[PDB]
Design a protein around this nucleic acid. Structure first.
Ligand SMILES: [Mg+2]
Ligand SMILES: [Mg+2]
Ligand SMILES: [Mg+2]
Ligand SMILES: [Mg+2]
Ligand SMILES: [Mg+2]
Ligand SMILES: [Mg+2]
Ligand SMILES: [Mg+2]
Ligand SMILES: [Mg+2]
Ligand SMILES: [Mg+2]
Ligand SMILES: [Mg+2]
Ligand SMILES: [Mg+2]
Ligand SMILES: [Mg+2]
Ligand SMILES: [Mg+2]
Ligand SMILES: [Mg+2]
Ligand SMILES: [Mg+2]
Ligand SMILES: [Mg+2]
Ligand SMILES: [Mg+2]
Ligand SMILES: [Mg+2]
Ligand SMILES: [Mg+2]
Ligand SMILES: [Mg+2]
Ligand SMILES: [Mg+2]
Lengths: 119, 249, 162, 198, 38
RNA sequence: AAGCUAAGUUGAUAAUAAAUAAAUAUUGAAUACAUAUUAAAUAUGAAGUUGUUUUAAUAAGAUAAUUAAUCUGAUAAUUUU
RNA sequence: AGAGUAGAUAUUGUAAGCUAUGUUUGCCACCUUCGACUCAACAUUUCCUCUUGGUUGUAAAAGCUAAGAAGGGUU
RNA sequence: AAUAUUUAAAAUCAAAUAUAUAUAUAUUUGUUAAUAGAUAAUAUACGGAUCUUAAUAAUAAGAAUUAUUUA
RNA sequence: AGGUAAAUAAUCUAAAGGGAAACAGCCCAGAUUAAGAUAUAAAGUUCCUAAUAAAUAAUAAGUGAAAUAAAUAUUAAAAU
C-alpha cells in the first residue's frame, strides 16, 4: 500500500453537521412525497387544497416503497437514529465491526440508515 | 519653556520591571570565561638555541623571544567595552610607515609609534597595569609557565597526505596514476553531496596557534631576551604573545 | 471615486504597544494578533502587493503566559546543514540564553506570510523583557487621554530618559 | 482530611499566629491553580519557626483549652484537603520542635567507624572507611554533639532538617546486609544474611 | 531491579508507587520484588 | 651549507562551575497506616548536557585624523616574513 | 510448564499467544557485480570506559542479569 | 465503608413518536477515562507557526483536543 | 503484497474545477464565450489562508490537532 490515500478514520465536526443535514433533507423529501399523495387523494374525493391540508385525517400511502420508507424501524428519521448509525457503518472485516461512514463510496448520496441490531 | 509632547497611558501606567540577565551578554560571558589575572607581553621570535642546565647537564631546546619597547598603550574596561584587557604595543617604527591617524592615536597616549599592537585580556581590574609603564623580561619569573600565541609557518597548497596524514594508495601492484589521493569522498547518491567539513586538499599555515604550558628557563633584561623551553609557532621575526598560563598555576 | 483624496495618513506606520503584564492572552494567541497588525489586515487600505504593517512594541515579556508544560518540554530546532549537527533547545534554554522576546519573535515569524516582506515585517516587532525601551515616545498618544496621567509621572517619562 | 480535623493542643508557652505575605507567590499547575498569601509564625521557648501556608487555609482560634482548629473553605476539592492535612502535620511538628526539640541518634557499628566533630562543632567528620576525608558541614539551626565516637546525637527545631541531615550522613555507608556496618538513623534494624562464606 | 510492562505485587509488603510518570514497586521484606513499569 | 622532513624536539586530552538521566533520600497528607511527590516544601547523582579551552568568520564598540607640499589606498620597482 | 541443593520469576523460560525491524532465505513484477586499498558520515538494539538496581545463587576479587549513557576507543 | 463480579438500553428504567386516545399497544433512543506496552540509521515533522488560562485588572483572553448539538 | 483471477458499481483511460499539504483511480463537481450580482456541493472559518459565535461533559497525556499499534499491567469512575 505505497500510494497514500490520506483518508482519516474520523470525521470533523463540520462533516457531521453536513451529514445530519443530508439525512434531514432525505426525510423531508419522504415527508413531502406522502403529503402530495394525501392531498391528491383528498382532491379526488372532492375536497379543495386548503381543507385537504387542514383535514384531520391524513391518508397514509399505499405503495410498498412509501409505506416502508415511513416506518421508523425500516427507515429511521435523523432525530430517531443513534449517533453511531449516523456516522458509522457496519463492516464485517473491520475491528469493532464498524468503519467510518465517510469511507463508503458516494456516502454523501447513498443512504445507509439501518445496521444489524447487535452490531 | 515646555515643548509639546503627549504620552499614551499604555506606558505611563505600566509597572516597572528589570529585565533578567541572559547568557548572550558580555557580563555573563565575561564571568564564565577562564582568563589570567596578569597582563602579557609582545615578543619577536629571534630563533632557537640549546639551554644547558649546569646542575644536571640536561640539554633542552629553547627559543629566544626578545622584548623591545613593550609599553602599555591604553586600557579596556567592562563599563565602556564589556571586557577587561590591556592594549600593549611593541617596538619602534618610522613615522613614514605609521598612518597619520595612528600617529595621532599614539601621541594621545604619549607613546612612540609601534611595530605591533595587541590586547591581553585579564580577569578583573586588579590585573590592569597603568598605561605608559614599560615592561621588562623580569616581568616573568624563573621556572613559571606561560602560554604563547603566534601565527604558524605558511605551507601553501598542501595535499591530503601532508595535511591530515592520509596514507594514500598502494605504491605498486597495478595502481594507476593516482597515488597521492584520499580515494573516496562520500556515499553513493543517498546524501547526493559531499558533506560539509570533508577533509580535502587545501592551504595550511598562516594560522593562529596557541601552545600552552611553555616553561620559562631564563629571564634576563641586560640582553632583552626571554628563554622558553620548546618550540614557538611562527618563523624568524614573528610576533608572539606571552601571558601567564591559566591551566598550570 | 473613494480612492481619490489624501492617502498619506492612511499609509502611516503607527506604533502600537502591548503590555504582557496586563494582556491576558497566551503566547500563541498573542502572536496571531501581533501578526495581523504587522501584515496590515486591520487597515481597510490593505493590498497583498503592499507592505502596510505597523510597528509593534512589546514590553514586560517576562510575564508571558505559556500553558501546559511547554516551558520545559517544547523544543526548538536549528540544523546547520551538516549531518549529525542538529541542535534541539528547549524553551527554557532559549529564554535563559536569549530572552522571552525571542519566543514571541519566533512565534510571530511563522505566522507571517512566506514572502519577501517577511523579514521586513519581523524587524517591525520590538520585544523587550522589561519595561525599559527606547521607543517610549514612539506610540500613538492623544490629547483627550492625558488627563488620567499625573503631571510628575508624565514629565519623568518624557524628559528623564536613559 | 481526617488528620487535618484533629484538634491541636497549644501550650501557653508556645504561641501560634497567622499572617499575610506582601509578595504572594502564585505557582501554576494543570487544571488546578495554587495561591500562597498567608504566613504562620510559630514561636516558642526553643526558638521560632515560620511556614508559608496557602491562602485557602485559615486557622480557628480558641483561647480556652488551648485548642486551635485548621479549616479550609472547600474540603471537596482534593487539592485543598491534601494541603489541609500536610499543614496540620507540619505546624504540629513545628510546635513539638519549639517546645521539646527533635532528636536523632546516629550509631556506627563497624570497627574503626566513628564520627568526630571539627571546626568547633560546625563540621562532622565521618570515618566509615575511605582514603579521603569524608563529611558534611552542619547547617544553620542544627546542633550536633557526640557523646562517644561510636554514637552521635543531632537535634534542631525542624524535624525535616534534622532527619535530612541524618539521612545525608547515612549515605556515606548504609547498613550492610551481611554484617551490620554503617550509620543507623534511629532504632531501625537491618536483617542480616546467613554467614555462608565461600 | 525488574523492568517489565507488567508490574505485580507478590509480597504482602510490596507497595505501589507513582513517580516520574512511571509505576514502581518496593518490598521491604525482600528486594527481589522491585519492579518498574517499562 | 641553507631549506624540507621524522626516525627527532615541545605541548595539548581544555579546568572551575550550573541544571540533570537511571538510581539513593527527609517532612508529608489526599487515604488514621504507608508513600522520596504522576501533591506543596527539602537533598544527592554519570566519561552524558550546558559550559570551558582552541581555530575560522562578521564587526557591536573604542582611539585618532579628517582638502592633504610626510591624508588613506592602488598602479609601478627590489623581495620572503 | 520445568531446571536452578530448598523456591517458577538471582540465572534460566518447552510447545502455543501479541507484537516491532526490514539487517538472512523467500513471494510480486511498478522499475532492465563479490572482495581488497583510501576516506569515512550516521543510528544504538552498548564490546570497553562512566553512574546504578537485583544476585538463599552480591563474603572480597572476579562474575551473571538489568537501567541511564553514543564523549572517547573498538588489531 | 470493606469484599467479589460486569461495564451492559438484550432484560429493566427514563424519554420521544404512531394508533385505539386521561390508559393501553407498538416503534425508536440512552451504559467509562488516563498512562506504560510504543522501537534505527542525512533533520525536529499535526503541512508550519502553534494550541490547555489567571481574581487583584485591561475598549478585550481563557483549546486551535475528544464526544453530542445549536445558529 | 502497489500480488494474481474473475463478479457488481464509479472514476482515470479520454476530464478541466473545488477539497484530501503535495496526489491519473478517493469526496464533490463535468470547461461555448463573457461578466460577476446571487444561491451554493465536497471541504473549511486563530495566523500562514478566502470565512464564526455558542451549549453540555471528558482530557492534563501536547494524548490529540487530516495515515487511530495489539495481548497485557497500573490507576481511577459507574452498576450489581
Ligand atoms: Mg604509501
Ligand atoms: Mg605510477
Ligand atoms: Mg562513483
Ligand atoms: Mg610526545
Ligand atoms: Mg503520615
Ligand atoms: Mg523508605
Ligand atoms: Mg561530569
Ligand atoms: Mg521445580
Ligand atoms: Mg516458544
Ligand atoms: Mg540505550
Ligand atoms: Mg565484587
Ligand atoms: Mg561534554
Ligand atoms: Mg429497547
Ligand atoms: Mg523524524
Ligand atoms: Mg493489480
Ligand atoms: Mg491508450
Ligand atoms: Mg481530475
Ligand atoms: Mg465519463
Ligand atoms: Mg459541459
Ligand atoms: Mg502530537
Ligand atoms: Mg489542512
Amino acid at each position: 500500500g505505497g500510494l497514500l490515500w490520506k483518508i482519516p478514520w474520523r470525521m470533523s465536526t463540520h462533516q457531521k453537521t453536513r451529514q445530519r443535514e443530508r439525512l434531514r433533507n432525505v426525510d423531508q423529501v419522504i415527508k413531502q412525497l406522502t403529503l402530495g399523495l394525501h392531498v391528491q387523494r383528498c382532491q379526488d374525493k372532492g375536497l379543495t387544497y386548503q381543507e385537504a391540508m387542514e383535514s384531520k385525517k391524513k391518508y397514509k400511502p399505499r405503495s410498498k416503497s412509501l409505506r416502508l420508507l415511513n416506518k421508523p424501524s425500516v427507515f429511521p428519521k435523523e432525530n430517531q437514529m443513534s449517533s453511531k448509525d449516523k456516522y458509522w457503518t457496519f463492516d464485517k472485516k473491520a475491528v469493532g465491526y464498524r468503519k467510518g461512514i465517510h469511507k463508503v463510496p458516494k456516502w454523501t448520496k447513498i443512504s445507509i440508515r439501518k445496521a444489524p441490531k447487535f452490531f | 519653556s515646555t515643548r509639546p509632547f503627549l504620552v499614551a497611558p499604555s506606558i505611563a501606567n505600566s509597572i516597572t520591571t528589570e529585565a533578567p540577565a541572559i547568557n548572550h551578554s558580555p557580563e555573563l560571558a565575561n564571568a564564565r570565561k577562564w582568563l589570567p589575572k596578569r597582563c602579557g607581553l609582545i615578543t619577536r621570535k629571534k630563533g632557537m638555541m640549546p639551554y644547558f642546565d649546569k646542575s644536571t647537564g640536561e640539554r633542552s631546546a629553547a627559543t629566544i623571544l626578545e622584548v623591545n619597547n613593550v609599553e602599555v598603550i591604553m586600557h579596556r574596561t567592562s563599563e565602556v567595552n564589556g571586557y577587561f584587557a590591556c592594549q600593549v604595543g611593541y617596538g619602534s617604527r618610522h613615522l613614514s610607515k605609521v598612518s597619520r591617524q595612528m600617529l595621532g592615536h599614539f601621541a594621545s597616549k604619549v607613546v612612540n609609534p609601534k611595530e605591533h599592537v595587541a590586547e591581553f585580556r585579564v580577569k578583573d581590574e586588579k590585573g590592569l597595569i597603568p598605561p605608559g609603564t614599560l615592561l621588562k623580561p623580569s616581568f616573568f619569573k624563573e621556572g613559571q609557565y606561560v602560554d604563547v600565541r603566534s601565527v604558524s609557518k605558511g605551507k601553501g597548497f598542501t595535499g591530503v597526505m601532508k595535511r591530515y596524514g592520509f596514507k594514500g594508495l598502494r605504491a605498486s601492484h597495478g595502481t594507476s596514476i593516482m597515488h597521492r589521493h584520499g580515494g573516496s569522498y562520500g556515499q553513493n547518491q543517498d546524501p547526493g553531496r559531499v558533506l560539509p567539513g570533508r577533509k580535502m586538499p587545501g592551504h595550511m599555515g598562516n594560522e593562529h596557534v596557541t601552545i600552552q604550558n611553555v616553561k620559562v628557563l631564563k629571564v634576563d633584561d641586560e640582553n632583552n631576551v626571554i628563554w622558553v623551553k620548546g618550540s614557538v609557532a611562527g618563523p624568524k621575526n614573528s610576533f608572539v604573545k606571552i601571558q601567564d598560563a591559566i591551566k598550570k598555576t | 471615486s473613494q480612492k481619490i483624496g489624501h492617502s498619506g495618513l492612511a499609509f502611516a506606520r503607527l506604533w502600537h504597544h502591548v503590555d504582557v503584564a496586563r494582556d491576558k492572552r497566551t503566547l500563541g494567541r498573542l502572536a496571531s494578533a501581533i501578526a495581523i497588525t504587522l501584515i496590515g489586515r486591520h487597515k481597510p487600505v490593505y493590498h497583498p502587493s503592499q507592505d502596510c504593517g505597523d510597528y509593534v512594541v512589546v514590553t514586560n515579556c517576562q510575564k508571558i503566559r505559556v500553558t501546559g508544560k511547554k516551558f520545559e518540554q517544547k523544543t526548538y530546532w536549528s540544523h546547520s546543514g551538516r549531518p549529525g549537527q542538529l541542535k534541539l533547545q528547549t524553551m527554557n534554554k532559549v529564554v535563559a540564553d536569549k530572552g522571552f522576546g525571542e519566543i514571541l519573535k519566533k512565534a510571530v515569524s511563522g505566522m507571517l506570510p512566506k514572502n519577501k516582506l517577511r523579514k521586513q515585517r519581523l524587524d517591525r516587532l520590538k520585544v523587550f523583557d522589561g519595561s525599559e525601551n527606547p521607543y517610549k515616545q514612539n506610540i500613538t498618544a492623544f490629547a483627550h487621554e492625558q488627563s488620567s496621567i499625573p503631571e510628575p509621572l508624565k514629565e519623568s517619562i518624557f524628559n528623564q530618559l536613559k | 482530611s481526617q488528620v487535618g480535623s484533629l484538634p491541636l493542643y497549644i501550650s501557653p508557652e508556645v504561641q501560634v499566629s497567622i499572617n499575610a505575605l506582601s509578595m504572594p507567590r502564585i505557582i501554576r499547575k494543570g487544571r488546578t491553580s495554587m495561591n500562597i498569601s498567608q504566613n504562620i509564625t510559630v514561636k516558642g521557648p526553643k526558638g521560632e519557626l515560620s511556614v508559608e501556608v496557602p491562602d485557602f487555609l485559615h486557622l480557628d482560634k480558641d483561647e480556652k483549652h488551648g485548642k486551635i482548629n485548621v479549616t479550609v473553605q472547600n474540603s471537596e476539592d482534593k487539592h485543598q484537603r491534601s494541603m489541609w492535612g500536610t499543614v496540620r502535620s507540619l505546624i504540629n511538628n513545628h510546635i513539638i520542635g519549639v517546645t521539646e526539640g527533635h532528636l536523632a541518634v546516629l550509631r556506627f557499628v563497624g570497627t574503626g567507624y566513628r564520627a568526630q566533630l571539627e571546626n568547633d562543632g560546625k563540621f562532622v567528620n565521618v570515618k566509615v572507611g575511605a582514603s579521603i576525608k569524608q563529611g558534611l558541614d552542619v547547617p544553620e539551626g542544627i546542633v550536633v554533639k557526640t557523646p562517644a565516637p561510636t554514637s552521635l546525637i543531632i537535634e534542631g527545631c525542624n524535624k525535616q532538617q534534622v532527619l535530612l541531615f541524618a539521612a545525608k550522613l547515612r549515605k556515606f555507608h548504609p547498613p550492610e546486609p551481611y554484617k551490620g556496618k554503617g550509620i543507623y538513623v534511629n532504632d531501625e534494624t537491618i536483617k542480616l544474611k546467613d554467614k555462608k562464606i565461600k | 531491579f525488574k523492568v517489565r510492562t507488567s508490574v505485580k505485587k507478590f509480597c504482602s509488603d510490596c507497595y505501589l508507587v507513582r513517580r516520574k510518570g512511571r509505576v514502581y514497586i518496593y518490598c521491604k521484606s525482600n528486594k527481589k520484588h522491585k519492579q518498574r513499569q517499562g
